[PDB]
Design a protein around this nucleic acid. Structure first.
Length: 67
DNA sequence: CAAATAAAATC
DNA sequence: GATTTTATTTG
């Protein structure tokens, strides 16, 4: 546990981290691959990529134990 | 495309 | 209420 709000599909996040770790961002042909697998509309696939950038920032902020 | 705060949702 | 995780957002 140890979490607040719930996320979407673990498969989506997993593949998101996968492609993200490959470089940072990918082409439309690659995003479409993820979209077809997550049943997304392509557009939101690119949004989640940007969201991943703030995700890591949140982790670094938590790794402080100042509260 | 990128950094992200709002914002909802769980606690 | 606090944290966390996405959508709306402008550069």
């Amino acid at each position: 546990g140890r979490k607040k709000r719930v996320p979407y599909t673990k498969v989506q996040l997993k593949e998101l981290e996968r492609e993200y770790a490959t470089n940072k961002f990918i082409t439309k042909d690659k995003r479409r691959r993820i979209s077809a697998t997550t049943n997304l509309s392509e557009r939101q696939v690119t949004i989640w990529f940007q969201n991943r950038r703030v995700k890591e920032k949140k982790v670094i902020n938590k790794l402080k134990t100042t509260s």
